[PDB]
Amino acid sequence: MSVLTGDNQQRGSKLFKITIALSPTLAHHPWPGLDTHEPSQSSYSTIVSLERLLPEMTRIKRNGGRILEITEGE
Amino acid sequence: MQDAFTKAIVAADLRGSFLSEQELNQLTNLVKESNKRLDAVNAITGNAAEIISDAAHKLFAEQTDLIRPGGNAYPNRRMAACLRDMEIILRYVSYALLAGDASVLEDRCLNGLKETYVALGTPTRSVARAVQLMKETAIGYVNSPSGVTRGDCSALVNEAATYFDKAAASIA
Amino acid sequence: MQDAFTKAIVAADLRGSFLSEQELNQLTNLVKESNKRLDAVNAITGNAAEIISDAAHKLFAEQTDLIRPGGNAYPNRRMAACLRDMEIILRYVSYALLAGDASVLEDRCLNGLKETYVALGTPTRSVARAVQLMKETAIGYVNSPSGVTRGDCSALVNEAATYFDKAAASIA
Amino acid sequence: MQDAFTKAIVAADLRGSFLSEQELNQLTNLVKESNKRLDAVNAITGNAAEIISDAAHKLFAEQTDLIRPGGNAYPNRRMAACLRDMEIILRYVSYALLAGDASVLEDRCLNGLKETYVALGTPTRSVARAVQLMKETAIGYVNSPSGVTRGDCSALVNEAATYFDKAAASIA
Amino acid sequence: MKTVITEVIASADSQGRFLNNTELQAANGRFQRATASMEAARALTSNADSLVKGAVQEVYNKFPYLTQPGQMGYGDTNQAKCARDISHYLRFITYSLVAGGTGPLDDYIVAGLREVNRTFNLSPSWYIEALKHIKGKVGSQLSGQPLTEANAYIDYCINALS
Amino acid sequence: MKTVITEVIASADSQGRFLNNTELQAANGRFQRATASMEAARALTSNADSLVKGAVQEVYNKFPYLTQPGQMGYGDTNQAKCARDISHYLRFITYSLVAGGTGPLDDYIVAGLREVNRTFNLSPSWYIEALKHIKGKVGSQLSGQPLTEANAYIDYCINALS
Amino acid sequence: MKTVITEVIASADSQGRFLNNTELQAANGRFQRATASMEAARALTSNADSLVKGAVQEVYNKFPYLTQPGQMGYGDTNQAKCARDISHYLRFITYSLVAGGTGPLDDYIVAGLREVNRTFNLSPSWYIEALKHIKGKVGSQLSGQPLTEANAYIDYCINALS
Amino acid sequence: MKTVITEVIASADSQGRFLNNTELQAANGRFQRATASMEAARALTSNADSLVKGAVQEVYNKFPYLTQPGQMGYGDTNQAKCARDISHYLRFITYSLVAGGTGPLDDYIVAGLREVNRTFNLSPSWYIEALKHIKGKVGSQLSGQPLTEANAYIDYCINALS
Amino acid sequence: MNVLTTSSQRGGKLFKVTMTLSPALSHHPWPSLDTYEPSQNSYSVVVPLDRLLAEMTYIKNKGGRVLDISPADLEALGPPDISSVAIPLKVELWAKADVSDVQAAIVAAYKQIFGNTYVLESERLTSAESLLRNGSISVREFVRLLAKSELYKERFFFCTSNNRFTELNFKHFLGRAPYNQSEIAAHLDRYQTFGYDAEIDSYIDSDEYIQAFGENVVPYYRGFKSQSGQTVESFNRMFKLYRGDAGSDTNLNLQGQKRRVDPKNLLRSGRGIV
Ligand SMILES: CCC1=C(C)/C(=C/C2=NC(=C\c3[nH]c(/C=C4\NC(=O)[C@H](C)[C@H]4CC)c(C)c3CCC(=O)O)/C(CCC(=O)O)=C2C)NC1=O
Ligand SMILES: CCC1=C(C)/C(=C/C2=NC(=C\c3[nH]c(/C=C4\NC(=O)[C@H](C)[C@H]4CC)c(C)c3CCC(=O)O)/C(CCC(=O)O)=C2C)NC1=O
Ligand SMILES: CCC1=C(C)/C(=C/C2=NC(=C\c3[nH]c(/C=C4\NC(=O)[C@H](C)[C@H]4CC)c(C)c3CCC(=O)O)/C(CCC(=O)O)=C2C)NC1=O
Ligand SMILES: CCC1=C(C)/C(=C/C2=NC(=C\c3[nH]c(/C=C4\NC(=O)[C@H](C)[C@H]4CC)c(C)c3CCC(=O)O)/C(CCC(=O)O)=C2C)NC1=O
Ligand SMILES: CCC1=C(C)/C(=C/C2=NC(=C\c3[nH]c(/C=C4\NC(=O)[C@H](C)[C@H]4CC)c(C)c3CCC(=O)O)/C(CCC(=O)O)=C2C)NC1=O
Ligand SMILES: CCC1=C(C)/C(=C/C2=NC(=C\c3[nH]c(/C=C4\NC(=O)[C@H](C)[C@H]4CC)c(C)c3CCC(=O)O)/C(CCC(=O)O)=C2C)NC1=O
Ligand SMILES: CCC1=C(C)/C(=C/C2=NC(=C\c3[nH]c(/C=C4\NC(=O)[C@H](C)[C@H]4CC)c(C)c3CCC(=O)O)/C(CCC(=O)O)=C2C)NC1=O
Ligand SMILES: CCC1=C(C)/C(=C/C2=NC(=C\c3[nH]c(/C=C4\NC(=O)[C@H](C)[C@H]4CC)c(C)c3CCC(=O)O)/C(CCC(=O)O)=C2C)NC1=O
Ligand SMILES: CCC1=C(C)/C(=C/C2=NC(=C\c3[nH]c(/C=C4\NC(=O)[C@H](C)[C@H]4CC)c(C)c3CCC(=O)O)/C(CCC(=O)O)=C2C)NC1=O
Ligand SMILES: CCC1=C(C)/C(=C/C2=NC(=C\c3[nH]c(/C=C4\NC(=O)[C@H](C)[C@H]4CC)c(C)c3CCC(=O)O)/C(CCC(=O)O)=C2C)NC1=O
Ligand SMILES: CCC1=C(C)/C(=C/C2=NC(=C\c3[nH]c(/C=C4\NC(=O)[C@H](C)[C@H]4CC)c(C)c3CCC(=O)O)/C(CCC(=O)O)=C2C)NC1=O
Ligand SMILES: CCC1=C(C)/C(=C/C2=NC(=C\c3[nH]c(/C=C4\NC(=O)[C@H](C)[C@H]4CC)c(C)c3CCC(=O)O)/C(CCC(=O)O)=C2C)NC1=O
């Protein structure tokens, strides 16, 4: 389950579980048709280390998806 | 991944046993019907595009709301996505028409589906309607093909149906 | 990402319609006030460092617990993180101000932020306050700048405030 | 990456100097002709597909060996690669044309081809011929467009040509 | 959704950077150009439908076999869905005009276009010919920079379909 | 080197895409803005001599102690290298004005600034105070959009140093 | 080039592994199947001439308008390049039959197909109709497993074009 | 679990692709081969009892010292766990025969083998010698393609242990 | 002396050598000063095995520097065959997979992302694969999850310079060679101030990446075909980057992980500032 297992090989210090409404702005099936996505990935839970927290968020917003939540990983 | 033999083997092993003469002959029969099975899988592959297309035409004939603004198969980006995962149910059901076991679905299609389409607000019955239409047409093709030897494929048509029906049930 | 025009377009499309003469002129007015808007965004960019610094000096003047051991802006590492967050929020507020829409702020910055801070033990009420101080000083600058043509920027000062107030509300 | 201004700046800096009144007015003139420049870049963008297509039809009209087996635009995979390269080069020529500097063209891209295609055995003179065909048609469009104000675009047509000619020379 | 404003903001954000004079100069372009854009928008807005019926018919006149029985320009439903589709294109053209970029076209018509058209047996040629016709008539509804804008976006759709 | 032109081209290239109406609108901003920019540039260019001597002195007047013996505002070489450095800043400001973006400042002064200043024991405060002074005097050499441009870039340097 | 043999070898290599009973069983399929495949190949090979002329004509009979002036089924060169193209397809079908996989079709016709057809204004519908016709006639040149093989590959091309 | 069927399906899935003639030819191999495989399976199944006792003993006859006190072929529990282990191998051989691939062997005996044997002080040599003996006797229970199959898998285990 | 034919005469192993010569070996017979031809700045010559020790000794003495020795017969078999990879097979992951659909993806991401080095079974990222199977994450994350892993850090980053890392990164993550000297520089400066992790994100959240791979497509080769905003010389870099189907990224080379794209070569495509 994306119910993070362990530290999910992130190492680092704290783990924050961040969920975003990722677009079609990002992702996109290799298919010929319209940079879409496979319904189901509307919200994308993801666990990142404290050191990598800021960079990831910057490139999430930059590519258009918007963060929906944030909780410390444990 | 399992196929019908692998499934037998896993159940035997859980007993600590060599395969039962029961299980052996069930598998001998699968080998017996395997040419028919190959034709059945070939029927789907050879008409994949039309199966998806025809299912599609009919889905939107019935549910003209999906192609209005506000609808989940509008605009082109989303209509393309719809065509794609109709292709999805079709192909995964076709790969299942091969194993003699649903697990390829229980392990994936029947797993996590609670927090999918439902999370998105995608109406599963409409996805299941497209699945149901793919089933009708796919089986149509399994039953009426190009110069295949005449015989009875109803056992295989049933089994293909249950794969289509698994997917539908899992999604709705 | 949305801007004020893009927002109009999305609402129009959900009706299946070309933009209403209502919506057209609302957007004509945004173009009318756009030089002022550019000065307002420029006011923030041109004083970003001081806006953060001055907010900061004042935050710790009020809340001397944050800079004691045990406090969330102690030692240097944590103070740098806090100074960095002040900059990040001021940055997305300026983006919203160029855009005429809060969405970039809500989607890339505010979404999940409160729950992050709570997980971290970062006192959200103090963060809300730091945002209130940035607002005071930022607007100060929007209202009293270098040789800009004299006129009325209160509409824009309000709108900037609501972006600061969104962030504060979202975090506290 | 350079544009025509950036180029001026780099040369000035190498003298340790503020821009010469000479260089200033050369750049004032570029700003003077910039609406024409935008139309010229727009002429190419607005007809990119036809420019490539028409160049292509004509390239293979002349060199019917490329579309025979043994030929470098056979089978479909290779033709798609060749069509893709035509687009890539037309694209960087349009970038150079917006920039006023072959620094995104001659600088940002005309070198390995000669040796590489000679190594791939690709006849460079034929590749230069494809660029000439694009050039002919592209300039055609720069000179005869939809309701643009009448005037003299020959300076810009020349400059566009030199970008096409750089590419040709670099590759043959 | 691609506009001058969103583009400069995206570029700032991705470098972790406040908007600077480079980015604000850019924005001024978009704001200075709103008047011409929005005049084109108003003219295209009020003179609208007939463009669709004109282009629909022209698809059948150029592909006669189209309006014959057994074909895809026959019966109320095909001809209805055609008008609708050209109307979608003109709608997004006006949106792209108003928005200051191709975003609306990219997100709602270009992304996925070919896959859809290929599954449904819709030839791009029709749509190009609908748009070529719309481009002919828009020659006398507008002029100057409003026409250039209208053209920019019509041509953008034609290239998306080639 | 960051200019409006290079930025839009970079963004097109990275998506494998021809320049479209979004990108050309952006470019028009940069070209429309050139007149104000270049007026600022000409005024800063001809006053350079005195702007530099004014700011150099102001560094000593605000930090009196710098000009005492054993200090870094003492002797011909320190005071010479100071004038030069402010002159470098004004030079790149004019370049940024002419170029239509912060590129010249980013590439030739900002990239590496702190490391250099830290190794050589140069306090940013001096440089901020040089620039604050230059900003005071440029208030009466320019006005309107040329002043706004001059300000944009002077302030950009001050933020780079804080 | 995708064949049963290359596929199993690829799968072994990528796991750093000798071919095992799984992979050799697979190969036996390809070898056992060669007889039917190669009978289809010989029949398609000697009838090539007429299969091509039959399908070429059928493209004009199904799309009558193609053969009128100003159209793409008119003049010696279009009609010549058409015969050639169907001949290419039949050629690669025979190759795929002989090779024991779709490789020849994948590498020489499928990779790039749509881009090429789209640049040159070639409708897949023609090619599907050429192939549907070839499929009709191959019904009486072959039967049993040679027909199934011929069908497999003809249908594979039709799906590649939809 | 590696079988011809799972392998071709895996390869299709990973390219996002329907099963094609390449993959179905492969499957036919596995199905055509089932008869020989399953004959080997039935013979190994009913002789299991004696094949195991034969190989167990042969481990002691080839390594006489194992059966002395203080050694790992002494006492009921060692000798019991040995019979069991060879029985595990024969069991998975029959499974691999029936399954059409090495999967059952790979997943249940090969993955982890050396780590386990090394921690428990079990020499592969014994197991190779058990299998060499089983291979000797299976020479007269089977012949033709059933023997080749039995051999394929016995040898596969011996290579896994070297 | 340049590009060779043939191997041996009596029998040998021909090695071709490359150097950089002073006017001490080769000069014009002119009236002044000794100079060698400017284009034979680095010169190469093929010598059979016995004459080889004597030649290297001579060259080193009279001033030259040996740049390389490599057998002639290695170097006669051309440049790689690229048919498998001109146009690849795309491998995507559907919403609701059949399970072995998902098996296909993992094997391919591995091959492509790790650059064809063997990833042994002890080695694989199992917990992360669990995630993809349940949906949870999409085919993009494993492309991102694999890159931040130690295995990726260890074979490609820790032991080579930053120039090399970035060049590999473009090949793996984007499928294309690195177009400009600016690209190399822009990246090296990012790693230096935001760390390794931020820098990894920068290829996976890029616009170029997003267009081609979207989110459910495994990154695949695409640099053997013309792309947009690609200098022309980036199609010759791709040959230097990929050495054939049996070639791989390999950090186990005797000489170590090194370059493959000459720094001089990158500058030919343009030089600016920053
Ligand atoms: C991690 C990889 C990944 C996946 C899998 C993903 C799924 C995903 N699908 C979405 C939407 C969507 N998905 C669909 C899909 C469908 N509609 C139907 O009727 C069919 C049953 C089905 C196609 C088979 C539609 C129609 C939407 C748009 C819903 C709306 O905005 O109303 C969204 C919302 C954001 C957007 O619209 O771009 C996400 C995040 N996103 C991702 O990043
Ligand atoms: C390339 C992979 C591959 C395929 C596809 C394959 C097909 C195949 N199908 C066969 C038979 C057949 N196939 C069918 C199938 C059908 N009968 C019907 O009436 C239905 C419409 C259809 C249901 C699926 C039947 C009835 C037979 C004859 C009985 C049998 O052999 O089991 C046979 C035995 C020879 C023959 O009688 O023609 C082969 C070899 N063999 C292969 O190696
Ligand atoms: C999307 C843009 C974005 C935001 C907004 C963001 C917030 C954010 N702030 C963080 C930490 C932090 N934030 C602060 C902030 C404060 N401490 C105080 O006492 C004050 C009340 C306040 C300053 C006003 C501190 C001290 C930490 C470090 C907490 C710790 O590690 O103990 C972290 C954890 C990762 C890290 O330390 O780098 C995130 C993700 N990250 C982002 O990427
Ligand atoms: C480089 C990007 C860029 C900027 C920044 C820009 C600014 C700009 N601000 C302007 C006007 C102005 N700007 C303001 C702004 C203000 N008035 C006040 O009293 C407040 C202190 C402040 C509130 C924000 C006002 C009142 C005008 C005159 C009215 C108007 O033109 O709307 C004008 C019209 C010319 C003029 O009257 O000076 C320009 C071009 N143009 C650009 O291209
Ligand atoms: C600076 C602008 C620019 C140019 C000009 C350019 C050329 C160029 N052409 C390439 C490939 C190619 N070019 C062709 C072209 C042809 N094949 C034929 O048989 C014909 C004779 C000819 C078409 C007329 C083909 C087939 C390939 C692929 C070669 C392969 O991968 O096997 C490649 C390798 C990268 C790739 O495949 O994308 C480059 C860099 N790249 C650039 O960035
Ligand atoms: C959206 C980006 C953008 C574009 C494209 C743009 C075009 C543009 N082209 C213009 C003029 C013009 N454009 C041309 C161009 C041509 N004359 C010819 O006869 C040739 C066929 C063609 C050569 C390229 C000429 C001659 C003028 C009038 C003179 C001038 O203003 O320089 C003008 C001044 C107003 C006018 O006279 O119409 C604008 C605004 N402005 C923009 O902001
Ligand atoms: C938001 C932007 C958007 C576009 C552009 C769009 C196109 C589009 N056109 C469609 C169908 C269609 N399109 C046409 C088009 C035509 N028929 C004719 O008489 C002419 C030849 C031609 C007009 C030039 C026809 C006949 C169909 C019905 C196809 C079918 O279901 O068989 C469908 C299938 C769903 C449906 O049946 O409505 C889509 C998605 N959908 C969108 O959401
Ligand atoms: C291209 C842009 C650029 C800048 C901005 C630049 C700054 C710069 N200032 C330097 C030194 C210096 N800078 C100063 C500055 C001052 N001394 C005073 O009297 C005042 C307090 C102050 C002026 C406000 C001094 C005294 C040195 C000599 C430091 C030393 O070597 O001890 C040096 C060291 C190399 C040298 O000694 O020249 C650099 C690189 N270099 C550049 O290339
Ligand atoms: C190796 C496999 C392979 C295929 C399949 C292939 C297709 C192909 N067909 C082409 C042209 C063509 N294809 C046709 C096709 C037709 N014209 C008609 O009368 C009918 C409607 C139709 C036949 C059904 C026509 C008319 C052209 C000329 C297009 C042009 O240049 O305008 C071209 C452009 C180069 C050229 O002009 O020859 C390619 C590459 N090329 C290949 O290398
Ligand atoms: C599913 C497949 C599978 C295999 C193959 C397997 C091997 C295996 N053999 C074991 C022990 C053993 N194996 C033997 C083997 C032998 N002793 C003798 O007399 C002979 C020399 C030899 C037989 C040739 C012995 C003596 C032990 C006990 C080792 C100990 O615990 O000290 C153990 C340790 C757990 C236990 O004590 O049972 C494993 C896991 N386990 C498995 O699950
Ligand atoms: C094909 C016609 C041809 C050319 C063009 C040529 C160039 C050339 N210039 C050389 C040296 C040289 N060239 C220069 C030139 C300069 N030094 C400077 O500082 C200035 C910037 C510049 C004069 C403007 C110098 C100083 C050397 C000697 C370098 C040395 O030995 O240290 C050499 C090395 C051999 C020699 O020294 O004779 C060659 C081959 N040789 C040729 O055969
Ligand atoms: C600048 C002054 C100068 C030096 C130093 C020099 C070295 C030199 N040693 C050479 C060969 C050689 N050098 C040796 C030396 C040795 N073989 C061994 O096993 C020992 C380890 C070692 C003796 C201690 C041998 C055996 C060859 C002949 C290699 C061959 O042809 O197979 C050659 C190739 C040309 C020739 O064989 O004459 C050169 C150039 N040449 C020079 O002009």
Coordinates of C-alpha atoms and ligand atoms in Angstrom, one line a residue, chain A residues 20-29 35-44, chain B residues 59-60 66 70-75 77-89 117 120-124 126-128 130 171, chain I residues 93-95 136-141 215-216, ligand 1:
Chain A
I20 CA -0.9 16.3 -4.9
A21 CA -3.6 16.7 -7.6
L22 CA -1.2 15.9 -10.4
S23 CA -2.0 16.8 -13.9
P24 CA -1.6 15.9 -17.5
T25 CA 0.4 19.1 -17.2
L26 CA 2.7 16.2 -16.0
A27 CA 2.7 12.3 -16.5
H28 CA 0.9 11.4 -19.8
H29 CA 0.5 7.9 -21.2
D35 CA -1.2 14.1 -22.5
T36 CA -3.8 12.6 -20.1
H37 CA -3.4 10.0 -17.3
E38 CA -5.0 6.8 -16.0
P39 CA -7.9 8.0 -13.7
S40 CA -6.8 7.0 -10.3
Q41 CA -3.8 9.1 -10.1
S42 CA -5.8 12.2 -9.4
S43 CA -4.2 12.4 -5.9
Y44 CA -0.6 11.2 -5.7
Chain B
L59 CA -20.9 3.9 -25.1
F60 CA -21.3 7.6 -26.2
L66 CA -19.9 12.2 -21.3
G70 CA -18.8 18.8 -17.9
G71 CA -18.5 15.2 -19.0
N72 CA -15.7 12.8 -18.3
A73 CA -14.9 12.0 -21.9
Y74 CA -14.6 15.7 -22.9
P75 CA -12.4 17.4 -24.3
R77 CA -7.4 14.8 -23.8
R78 CA -10.1 13.0 -21.8
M79 CA -11.8 11.2 -24.8
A80 CA -8.3 9.9 -25.7
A81 CA -7.9 8.7 -22.1
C82 CA -11.3 6.9 -22.3
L83 CA -10.3 5.2 -25.6
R84 CA -7.0 4.2 -23.9
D85 CA -8.4 2.5 -20.8
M86 CA -11.2 0.8 -22.8
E87 CA -8.2 -0.7 -24.7
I88 CA -6.9 -1.4 -21.1
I89 CA -9.8 -3.5 -19.9
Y117 CA -12.1 5.9 -10.1
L120 CA -11.7 10.7 -9.0
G121 CA -15.5 10.8 -9.2
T122 CA -15.3 8.7 -12.4
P123 CA -18.6 6.8 -12.7
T124 CA -17.6 3.2 -12.5
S126 CA -20.1 3.9 -17.2
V127 CA -16.6 2.4 -17.2
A128 CA -18.3 -1.0 -16.6
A130 CA -17.8 0.3 -21.8
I171 CA -14.9 -1.2 -11.3
Chain I
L93 CA 1.5 1.2 -17.9
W94 CA -2.3 1.1 -18.0
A95 CA -4.8 2.0 -15.4
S136 CA 0.1 4.2 -5.5
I137 CA 2.6 5.6 -7.8
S138 CA 2.9 5.9 -11.6
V139 CA 5.6 5.0 -14.0
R140 CA 7.2 8.3 -13.5
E141 CA 8.0 7.8 -9.8
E215 CA 3.6 10.0 -17.0
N216 CA 3.0 6.4 -17.8
Ligands
LIG1 C1 0.7 8.8 -11.7 C2 0.2 8.7 -13.1 C3 -1.1 9.4 -13.1 C4 -2.5 8.8 -13.3 C5 -2.9 7.4 -13.5 C6 -3.3 10.1 -13.2 C7 -4.8 10.0 -13.2 C8 -5.7 11.2 -13.2 N1 -6.7 11.2 -14.0 C9 -7.3 12.4 -13.9 C10 -8.5 12.8 -14.6 C11 -9.3 12.1 -15.6 N2 -9.2 10.8 -15.9 C12 -10.2 10.5 -16.8 C13 -10.3 9.0 -17.3 C14 -11.4 8.4 -17.7 N3 -12.6 8.9 -17.9 C15 -13.5 7.9 -18.3 O1 -14.7 8.1 -18.4 C16 -12.9 6.6 -18.4 C17 -13.6 5.5 -17.6 C18 -11.4 6.9 -18.1 C19 -10.5 6.6 -19.2 C20 -10.3 5.1 -19.4 C21 -11.1 11.6 -17.1 C22 -12.3 11.8 -17.9 C23 -10.5 12.7 -16.2 C24 -11.0 14.1 -16.1 C25 -12.0 14.3 -15.0 C26 -12.6 15.7 -15.0 O2 -11.8 16.7 -14.9 O3 -13.8 15.8 -15.0 C27 -6.6 13.3 -12.9 C28 -6.9 14.7 -12.5 C29 -5.9 15.7 -13.1 C30 -6.1 15.8 -14.6 O4 -7.3 15.9 -15.1 O5 -5.1 15.9 -15.3 C31 -5.5 12.5 -12.4 C32 -4.4 12.9 -11.4 N4 -2.6 11.2 -13.0 C33 -1.4 10.8 -12.9 O6 -0.4 11.6 -12.7

